[PDB]
Design a binder for this molecule. Structure first.
Ligand SMILES: CC(=O)SCCNC(=O)CCNC(=O)[C@H](O)C(C)(C)COP(=O)(O)OP(=O)(O)OC[C@H]1O[C@@H](n2cnc3c(N)ncnc32)[C@H](O)[C@@H]1OP(=O)(O)O
Length: 141
């Protein structure tokens, strides 16, 4: 039902679509392609387009991937609501089962209450804070 499409396999329609989330100019298109090219070359980052029954519902990402940890991010398709939990399920499953990391980490601006609540609901704990960010983690064991 829920499937992950690696950014390394995106087609031009998908690239067009997702980078507009908030007449494509050549410089924007070219900058998106250069990003996708870096993803082909960098095993420490992985971005996925997430599908639910052949409909796009958001993007998830894992960066600073090591054998023990990673950072993650998520972004709901902007016309959809209530898909954060699905994206979070996928993030945790993929990190624990596919990357096999013990620690999942993120940081978010303190004003991002939607994201914080979602992380807290999935048993994340705030372990640090600076002027801009809260830093959260979840450990498998
Ligand atoms: C790459 C990155 O940007 S990573 C940083 C995190 N990602 C982002 O900030 C990207 C922009 N934001 C998003 O894509 C979305 O807002 C997401 C994915 C974070 C959340 O999406 P959704 O789950 O669709 O949002 P939704 O409107 O359902 O709200 C999620 C929950 O927070 C709750 N919430 C909303 N506002 C508040 C608030 N002020 N205080 C506490 N909780 C709140 C909702 O009631 C909801 O509760 P539930 O989980 O009990 O149902």
């Amino acid at each position: 039902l829920i499937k992950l499409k690696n950014f390394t396999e995106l087609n031009s329609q998908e690239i067009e679509l997702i980078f507009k989330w908030r007449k494509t100019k050549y410089i924007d298109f070219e900058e998106h392609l250069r990003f996708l090219k870096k993803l082909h070359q960098d095993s420490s980052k992985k971005y996925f387009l997430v599908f639910q029954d052949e409909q796009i519902i958001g993007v998830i990402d894992f960066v600073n991937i090591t054998t023990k940890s990673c950072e993650f991010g998520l972004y709901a398709k902007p016309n959809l609501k209530g898909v954060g939990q699905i994206l979070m399920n996928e993030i945790i499953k993929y990190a624990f089962e596919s990357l096999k990391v013990n620690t999942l980490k993120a940081y978010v601006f303190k004003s991002n209450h939607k994201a914080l609540k979602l992380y807290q609901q999935n048993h994340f704990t705030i372990y640090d804070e600076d002027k801009d960010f809260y830093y959260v983690y979840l450990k498998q064991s």
